[PDB]
Amino acid sequence: SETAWCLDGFERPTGVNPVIKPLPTKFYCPMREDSVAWEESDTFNPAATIYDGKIVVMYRAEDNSAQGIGSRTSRLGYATSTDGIHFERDTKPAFYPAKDNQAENECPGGTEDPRIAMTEDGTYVLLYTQWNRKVPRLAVATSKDLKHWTKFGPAFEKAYNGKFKDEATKSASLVTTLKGDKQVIAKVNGKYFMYWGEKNVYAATSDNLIDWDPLLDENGELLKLFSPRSGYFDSQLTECGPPAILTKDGIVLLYNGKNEPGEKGDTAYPANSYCAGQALFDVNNPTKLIGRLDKPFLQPTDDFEKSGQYPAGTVFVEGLVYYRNKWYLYYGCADSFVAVAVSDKQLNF
């Protein structure tokens, strides 16, 4: 099969979704200095990882402090599961804006759209968006326990004398691999590597997981590994999803395509909807694109995927774990809920 390399075979378990919905839970916010209903409006765009024998989903939670996409405060919840479907949720968010070293970048919009991957020595590396209602910035935090976090600030703060420190950035997929059943961050040609971006798929390297250097073209502009394309589901945006997976057949990148309305999109899919795709890069040259799905492997199907805070619908893939011999894929549903799909497919390592 020409698509044998992809991680497909996903199925929504019958009747279980969504697995995380909003709740009226309160916590004392150090940014507001006030008790806030931190997950009252929408719970979506989740990171996922494995810690202490369980699946952990860290979901993007929004309060009702305003109406409109990007108008409120995002904080990350902490939910655990032993079956991938039923979650036990903390009442206090595990990650949030505060009067800390990142206050200016994260106030008042908070901390959005997390992805998590883990090093071989057990360090969780969180890539997320800082939102201060001016510029979204991709930033890095680390922890050993997913609760005691150190914030290191924007991923591109230092690179090339700060060239990109005030550019709008988000949505990063670190390269990982499986060593046996254990999913860990993997160097490519001696460097840590990630795919990142929303408007195109860009990349960056690092020696230390915190300071990242975006790949550039000959003019010193961001190198576009691939881009939105006329006539396909990913015709307006190509936005990186969960961490990438280095297999024997290439580096697999799950990503989110936004469909251009009308004839320059794929009219098989709803206008403006986000449906999930996959790309494949060469293991030795990780900027060399060697595969890309013509059609999405996941699309809005249930009513809470087809419309919500985002009216045109999303299945926004962002968390992915290998647990109890299966893949559990966590995705945002129309910027409003978290859902799971499960696959038995075994990739080649």
Q: Which is nearer to Mg ion, 219 or 348 (CB)?
A: 348
* Backbone interruptions in the chain following residues (C to N > 2.5 Å): none
With CB atoms as reference, the residue minimizing the distance to Mg ion is 348
**C-alpha 342: how far from its chain's center?**
17
Task: Tell me: is residue 284 an annotated ligand-binding position.
Answer: no
State in angstroms the smallest separation of the CB of 347 from Mg ion: 9
Q: Which is nearer to Mg ion, 14 or 348 (CB)?
A: 348
State in angstroms the smallest separation of the CB of 326 from Mg ion: 18
Q: In the complex, which residues of this chain contact Mg ion (CB under 5 A)?
A: 348
Longest alpha-carbon distance in the chain: 57
State in angstroms the smallest separation of the CB of 349 from Mg ion: 5
State in angstroms the smallest separation of the CB of 348 from Mg ion: 4
Contact between residue 59 and residue 88 where contact means Cβ atoms under 8 Å apart: no
Phi, psi of 181 (to 5 degrees): -95, 5
Q: Which is nearer to Mg ion, 7 or 317 (CB)?
A: 7
State in angstroms the smallest separation of the CB of 215 from Mg ion: 29
Q: Which is nearer to Mg ion, 175 or 347 (CB)?
A: 347
Task: Tell me: is residue 219 an annotated ligand-binding position.
Answer: no
Q: Which is nearer to Mg ion, 253 or 347 (CB)?
A: 347
Burial 6-42 (b: 16+ CB within 10 A, else e): bbeebebeeeebbbbebeebebebebeeeebbbbbbb
The annotated binding site is made up of: 348-349
The annotated binding site for Mg(2+) is made up of: 348-349
